[PDB]
Design a protein around this ligand. Sequence first.
Ligand code: HEM
Ligand SMILES: C=C1CC[C@H](O)C/C1=C/C=C1\CCC[C@]2(C)[C@@H]([C@H](C)CCCC(C)C)CC[C@@H]12
Ligand code: NA
Length: 393
Amino acid sequence: PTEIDLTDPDVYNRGVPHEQFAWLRRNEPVYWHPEEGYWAVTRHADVVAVSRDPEIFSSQQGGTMIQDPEELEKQRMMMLNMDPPQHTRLRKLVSKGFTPRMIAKLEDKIRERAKQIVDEAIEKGECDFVADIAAELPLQVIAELIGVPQEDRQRLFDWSNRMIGYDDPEYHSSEADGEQAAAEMFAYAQELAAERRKNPRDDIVTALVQAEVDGQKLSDLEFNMFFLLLVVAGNETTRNAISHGMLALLEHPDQWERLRADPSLAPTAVDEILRWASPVMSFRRTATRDTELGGQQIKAGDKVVMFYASANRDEEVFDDPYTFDITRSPNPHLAFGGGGGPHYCLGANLARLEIRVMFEELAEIMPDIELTGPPERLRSNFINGIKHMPVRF
Ligand code: HEM
Ligand SMILES: C=C1CC[C@H](O)C/C1=C/C=C1\CCC[C@]2(C)[C@@H]([C@H](C)CCCC(C)C)CC[C@@H]12
Ligand code: NA
């Protein structure tokens, strides 16, 4: 196969290039793509090994985005781009509201919203599965969880689209759209923080302003950058799991029948949807010193790109990896990152709950859902996203 540039958004225009990943896994699983260049890491075990060693494979040294100085400095304030010990301290501060017990307290409220969202979509008849269902549930939930009034949730969605849509013409007008979105969101976040410091509420903003670990509290910039990451993660990952999951269910109709007949299949179905969609396709690291990975010699300063979508088709880990099987078990997919990595998704419990509740509700109402046209992909080299997906109920 020709040596495709996996950092180029256009190579994802016709979908995830799974044949390229399949050839790499079999023939060159740790592969130097020359240009500057980068190592493509495509096997599950090697993604896990890179993930769990931040001392060698740093997130701070070159950031975590896969394309090739002001950008790095303007984003080293993101928790994603920190290494221990800096990272360890920040993650201890912001994780309090995301433990499994805290998240499980939301199921009934999340189910109440999902039932109402599905009901209104069915009443409409013909709609956009993204705007009316897949994006709307995580949007309402993250607004309520953060503490943003429901009237303001559309501001959160528009900001988030501008933050990640920097390669898609529908979501960006030029290169500074995202920076301006961030400035607006920082001002909004600071207003909310000031209010909850004075008058605490049961929301994440209050949890964050009150948090204290080892004599430390969140600084202004730390708070603002974590608010930003929560809003973008809340709005640009789960909705694409739901959209690709619905598409997979319609295109593998036997699986949809099984789920409709047996709602107890939903927890395993969530993990197969996550393995299938792999909504976050890749993240980058930088080697801090000379090292060996999979018999390949990686030099200090080298860019290393972990392809979670390829890991989630690894024939050594998953039997029949190109089959969508909602009962697949076990299912050690890497959609949330390599297990053991210090940055492993902080919201994985919330994401699983949102996806589980939504598909339970779609399956129980038993509507006949059908596509009325092709879904439109987000242009991205990072997110495996669906912008629109016309359906009829
Ligand atoms: C399908 C949904 C999601 C997927 C596939 C996903 C994926 C990921 C991945 C791959 C990482 C980096 C892991 C690593 O580098 O080792 C990550 C980190 C993170 N995610 Fe998730 N995510 C999802 C939903 C969410 C949600 C809903 C939230 C919050 C409401 C969230 C919050 C975060 C945060 C704060 C981090 C940074 C953690 C750190 O740097 O220590 N994510 N996510
Ligand atoms: C930070 C600021 C705010 C200050 C400056 O505007 C620079 C900047 C960029 C933010 C970006 C760049 C693109 C990718 C980022 C970092 C998004 C990130 C990849 C989201 C990941 C979501 C989830 C998978 C964890 C969130 C914010 C985005
Ligand atoms: Na119908």
